[PDB]
Design a protein around this ligand. Sequence first.
Ligand SMILES: NC(=O)c1ccc2nc(-c3ccc(Oc4ccc(Cl)cc4)cc3)[nH]c2c1
Ligand SMILES: NC(=O)c1ccc2nc(-c3ccc(Oc4ccc(Cl)cc4)cc3)[nH]c2c1
Lengths: 285, 285
Amino acid sequence: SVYPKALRDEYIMSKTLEVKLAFERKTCKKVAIKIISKPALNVETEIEILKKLNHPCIIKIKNFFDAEDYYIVLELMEGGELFDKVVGNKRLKEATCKLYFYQMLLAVQYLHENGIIHRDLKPENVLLSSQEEDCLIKITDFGHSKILGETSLMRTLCGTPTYLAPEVLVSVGTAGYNRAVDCWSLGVILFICLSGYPPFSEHRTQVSLKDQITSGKYNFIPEVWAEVSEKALDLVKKLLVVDPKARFTTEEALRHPWLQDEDMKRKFQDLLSEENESTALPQVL
Amino acid sequence: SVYPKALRDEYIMSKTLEVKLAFERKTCKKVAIKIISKPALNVETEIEILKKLNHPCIIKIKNFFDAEDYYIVLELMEGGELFDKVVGNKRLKEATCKLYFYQMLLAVQYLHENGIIHRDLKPENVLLSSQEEDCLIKITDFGHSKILGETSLMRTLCGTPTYLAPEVLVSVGTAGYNRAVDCWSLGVILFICLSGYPPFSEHRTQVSLKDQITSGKYNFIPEVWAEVSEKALDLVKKLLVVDPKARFTTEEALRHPWLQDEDMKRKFQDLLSEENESTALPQVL
Ligand SMILES: NC(=O)c1ccc2nc(-c3ccc(Oc4ccc(Cl)cc4)cc3)[nH]c2c1
Ligand SMILES: NC(=O)c1ccc2nc(-c3ccc(Oc4ccc(Cl)cc4)cc3)[nH]c2c1
């Protein structure tokens, strides 16, 4: 198979990284083109979302092609995937874990604020802006994302439940906390970043991964965790809470002591203006 | 407002019954036109369903108009709504409750067999084929219906749950029993038909309707129920089961002793051929 004419007309395709590297002809700038074979639903959704959202720590869509396959043009992230930073028990310096996690929270906070649930948060979907270890991170892959509204339960709650089944009335209790699944994923991510190993795995253990996760009983190795602060460990503890309604929200996390770090936040504000310099159009005074 | 030209071109609109009576010009036959103001989703869904399904105890769609409002052309049911047969504590003869409920089960069985969940079963949506008390019933109003497939949970179960949240794994236990909400509604319907009064109501009671339903503790009045058989009461007991996974399915109901009644079933097979006579095109022998 070859690339669609319409694509080749604006872009020069290059290496693979499914995601390949491409060059926009008009600008000679680098771009990342994600190829998705033909699904429509998950692709329609992702596009609709990418177009509506705009936030520093959220990947932006530049172009899109509906051909024999789906082609999604995105801004290229020099840093690559966060996954390559933690694979094989690589341990990230805490100060940078914080810097990253802060951005992740801002992003997921943003999504939730806008009624979006990512649902597939993992190191593979966190992109770094540069080869520097101090950089911007951006969230990506909204193919599994969910959008909210009307819920139909609301619609049913408006009517008399004479003929309504018990399980549905019961569901009222927990309705509206689906977003908490993202906060779980973050907790699991932050755990990996901080310690270099996953909190729930089948490595040297006789309990099923399912049991570990539902019981919330993660694998805790003091030797490794001794290098990490108490504040950092505490936040993870409050994200890996089994009870969704008790689990921390992004807001509660952003307020947690471990995140009250001006040096880190400053460094973040600086990384922004840096990237925004090129885009800076003169302002009225 | 007036009716759309395209509608007036095939139909002569008449009384109201939102549902109005109409006459198809080509045949001078009577039809029922349901008007729905402009929602699309619930209407698109209902149409898609009505077109795919075909079953004696399921209302059939004859035509559809997408105008300033939505117009849905359906076959007219001389008998009207089952609701008008039970309002004000009217009590239906048991033999006819059975005859009706059997058809309702066949219909809901059919829906479930075809991955459809009605979700709004009630006397108002059960139509009688004639002014006779021995007649065909047909189910209608699929505006709140749900369709099944892929569930995405399956999609998630295929992957490693390293970053997956506990509440989702827990949901696995009960996933796939949404259809049971229809069986609840039937139980509630059959209760009304049999006794002339609703099993869960705020009439003379200090417990909230919600509590009644979730506890499954229905209002049982022996005086009224003394006129009804034990088999009939037993089936209702097995449909008004709080635990969805324990609740009776349509199949379990169709197998219940109270439904093992050849006189009733015969009378049903007879009502069919009767209605199918007019449609009967000569067969090869
Ligand atoms: N899940 C997605 O929807 C998605 C969306 C966009 C993505 N961009 C990458 C990516 C970016 C850079 C990589 O190394 C490089 C390669 C070249 C250069 Cl000059 C810098 C870093 C590897 C992967 N992965 C992506 C995934
Ligand atoms: N919920 C629906 O989507 C729906 C779909 C179709 C419906 N047809 C009626 C109906 C039928 C007959 C009625 O009395 C009559 C009127 C005239 C005659 Cl000659 C016989 C019975 C009343 C209501 N109600 C309907 C509701």
